[PDB]
Design a protein around this ligand. Structure first.
Ligand SMILES: [Mg+2]
Ligand SMILES: [Mg+2]
Ligand SMILES: [Mg+2]
Ligand SMILES: [Mg+2]
Ligand SMILES: [Mg+2]
Ligand SMILES: [Mg+2]
Ligand SMILES: [Mg+2]
Ligand SMILES: [Mg+2]
Ligand SMILES: [Mg+2]
Ligand SMILES: [Mg+2]
Ligand SMILES: [Mg+2]
Lengths: 45, 51, 97, 62, 117, 175, 48
RNA sequence: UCAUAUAGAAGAACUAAUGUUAGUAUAAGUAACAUGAAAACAUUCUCCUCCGCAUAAGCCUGCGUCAGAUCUGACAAUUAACAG
RNA sequence: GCUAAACCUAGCCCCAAACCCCCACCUUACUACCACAACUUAGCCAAACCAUUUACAUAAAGUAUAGGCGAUAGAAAUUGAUGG
């Protein structure tokens, strides 16, 4: 049975989508900048 | 209603300032100065000897 | 139902304001002015269309040439895409060969 | 006359990249964007493009 | 899966819940074995005055004259702070009139601010 | 002591209490530093009292009696803050001519944006700080493009605000 | 037109001038006025 | 330009693209869903569970009081010795 | 008779001109406080396959020239430049 692929975990969520992980690589800074440009108010998870 | 004053051509010689950046490359040099001399006479201010 | 019920407000046009009373004045500045000026030199409007005409492809090409380097990034990318598409269309699609 | 009327074609309207739903599975009409002229909020298939000039000059004698 | 609401100390697992403060200053440091040492110097000792005999109250009567907004400017302060001493001594080499050239040997440094409101 | 957290008991449940005028900036400027200190704490006690009263009213489902005193004391305390900060700033300019009390510098974030960075007083020098040298106070090339688009997105917003503001001037001159 | 209450200072005091201009902050002067004595000198920090 | 006509223009005409958006139908008041019993609303009785209590992880105020309704607002709360 | 049906502007599009702007925050971002580093567009697409190839002011001129001399590509010398 499927549908429960999201087993939430704050450590994982902050480690693999957080501000510092984005800022730790050029691609992540590009992601943050795209989301700054589009207007988002949730830049990083 | 009095019609607006007519559109008259830009009188005299047209000297564009050289320090500006938009003044194109071809409006400064010897050729434009030669054309202005040829078309407006000694009033253009070009020294003839440059020709 | 797609038709209005009350009458619209009356659009009052003043056929004798300054813009209409003086329309066309100086459209013979050439013939009646020793040819100092030309009628095109009274066309007020875009830098790249004053006194020139063409289909959309030529218009876009001209816009690119004359103000392409002043355009915003996204507008310029749209313009390049538009030229690419119009090229393909006008040169490969159509009833007439 | 310069006509200052522009209408966003199907490729100038925001978004619209992805295929909304697969072609075969569902029972809905095939569509390859949410911005076709067909769809609401899409682009005009044939509309006023850019500022258009209408200039032409008759022979001076005329 | 919630990313709009603020992130505060009430959110993560034990470790996060503990580490994240709540805007509260510190007053000490952790020693060995999760033991906390407090420092009497990093605790703000309030300095309250003696209010006895004071002839001023939270409000001011409606029978007070108005005046003009004249914000204190460096010139205005200098005018009546040191200038008259200069003029009195002008009738017959700057630290004597309150000038403080350097700010290492005083308790309340003006720049940077080493004190608190 | 704790009795001082509530107004004089004579004035409970009166729905009207008369208070004077909030101190104005010019009125404070005539007071010494000592008197401003004492005034500050008198206002502190009054503001605590009025906050208690307001919360109690909001708990009992009643309207606060004369809620203007609260804003009057808030304004008077802001005025006293302003006067003291002005004296401090004047003396700072005289004594060291600096503008801002807290040191800072204009830098570029990792996003290219020009920021004013306020310094955090630490104890070891900046080259030995493993945390402060993980920050990027510079901008690599890949941000320049995004620096342009932003500059454009905020020009459009300008233009639309200008053009519109003139259409509404034509309409206002066509009625 | 108006008579002041118990929490309203009289005009004699709200307009009195007791501010002799001085070259010391509020802190420096109040410390001396209330006789609280401090001698340890502030250390040196590294702003950045 | 007259001030419906003469001209000039053009996003210029939908019984049909498993078109798109919104409204309402049909199948249809059909398929399906729910509340153990009595009562004096205090209570008593019948029957059932690999269930329950706590920590962790997760969630973040999500049947506490009051006042409006058939859910909305206000007020209130979870006190370190346990754990970090 | 219900359901509805109707409306104007909030704004926006294209031009012209002018070069545009207290505290906390790179650790788990929005957390007062300890010993490395940055610097050739491939290909969808045309040739009805595909393999070399295939586009990113006016005039001279779609001329010279390039090219499975196919599809297509393509100069220069010189010329002169607030509005709807
Ligand atoms: Mg697209
Ligand atoms: Mg497709
Ligand atoms: Mg649209
Ligand atoms: Mg008709
Ligand atoms: Mg149509
Ligand atoms: Mg249909
Ligand atoms: Mg049936
Ligand atoms: Mg049934
Ligand atoms: Mg606690
Ligand atoms: Mg403990
Ligand atoms: Mg092919």
């Amino acid at each position: 049975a499927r549908g429960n692929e999201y087993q939430p975990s704050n450590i994982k969520r902050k480690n693999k989508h957080g501000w510092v992980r984005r800022l730790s690589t050029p691609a992540g800074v590009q992601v943050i900048l795209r989301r700054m440009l589009k207007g988002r108010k949730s830049l990083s998870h | 209603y009095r019609a607006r004053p007519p559109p008259r051509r830009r009188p005299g010689p047209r000297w564009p300032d050289p320090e500006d950046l938009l003044t194109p490359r071809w409006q400064l040099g010897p050729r434009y100065a030669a054309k202005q001399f040829a078309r407006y006479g000694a009033a253009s201010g070009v020294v003839p000897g440059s020709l | 139902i797609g038709i209005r019920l009350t009458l619209p407000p009356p659009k009052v046009v003043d056929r004798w304001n300054e813009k209409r009373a003086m329309f066309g004045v100086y459209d013979n500045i050439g013939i009646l002015g020793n040819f100092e000026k030309h009628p095109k030199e009274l066309i007020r409007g875009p830098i790249w269309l004053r006194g020139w005409k063409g289909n959309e492809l030529q218009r876009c090409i001209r816009k690119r040439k004359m103000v392409g380097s002043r355009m915003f990034a996204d507008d310029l990318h749209n313009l390049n895409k538009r030229i690419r598409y119009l090229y393909k269309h006008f040169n490969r699609h159509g009833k007439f060969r | 006359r310069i006509s200052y009327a522009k209408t966003k074609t199907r490729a100038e309207v925001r978004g619209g990249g992805r295929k909304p739903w697969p072609q075969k599975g569902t029972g809905r009409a095939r569509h390859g964007s949410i911005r076709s002229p067909l769809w609401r909020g899409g682009g005009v298939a044939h509309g006023p493009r850019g500022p258009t000039s209408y200039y032409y000059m008759l022979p001076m004698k005329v | 899966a919630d990313r709009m609401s603020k992130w505060t100390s009430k959110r993560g697992p034990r470790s996060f819940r503990g580490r994240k403060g709540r805007g509260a200053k510190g007053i000490g440091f952790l020693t060995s074995g999760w033991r906390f040492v407090q420092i009497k110097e990093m605790v703000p000792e309030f300095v309250v005055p003696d209010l006895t005999g004071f002839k001023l109250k939270p409000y001011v009567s409606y029978l007070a004259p108005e005046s003009e907004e004249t914000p204190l400017t460096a010139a205005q302060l200098f005018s009546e702070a040191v200038a008259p001493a200069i003029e009195k001594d002008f009738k017959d080499n700057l630290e004597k009139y309150g000038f403080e050239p350097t700010q290492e040997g005083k308790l309340f440094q003006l720049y940077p601010r080493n004190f608190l409101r | 002591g704790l009795e001082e957290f509530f107004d004089d008991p004579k004035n409970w449940g009166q729905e009207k209490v008369k208070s004077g005028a909030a101190w104005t900036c010019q009125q404070l400027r005539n007071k010494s530093n000592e008197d401003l200190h004492k005034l500050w704490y008198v206002l502190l006690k009054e503001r605590n009292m009025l906050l208690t009263l307001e919360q109690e009213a909001k708990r009992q489902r009643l309207p606060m009696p004369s809620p203007e005193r609260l804003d009057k004391v808030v304004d008077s305390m802001d005025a006293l803050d302003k006067v003291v900060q002005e004296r401090e700033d004047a003396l700072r300019l005289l004594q060291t001519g600096q503008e801002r009390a807290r040191p800072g510098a204009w830098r570029r974030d990792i996003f290219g944006r020009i920021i004013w960075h306020k310094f955090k007083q630490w104890v070891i020098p900046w080259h030995l700080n493993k945390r402060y040298n993980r920050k990027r106070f510079f901008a690599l090339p890949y941000v320049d493009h995004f620096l342009r688009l932003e500059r454009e997105k905020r020009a459009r917003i300008k233009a639309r605000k200008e053009n519109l503001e003139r259409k509404k001037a034509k309409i206002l001159l066509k009625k | 037109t108006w008579i002041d209450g118990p929490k309203d200072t009289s005009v004699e005091d709200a307009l009195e001038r007791t501010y002799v201009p001085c070259l010391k902050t509020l802190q420096e002067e109040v410390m001396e006025a209330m006789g609280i004595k401090e001698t340890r000198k502030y250390k040196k920090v590294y702003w950045y």
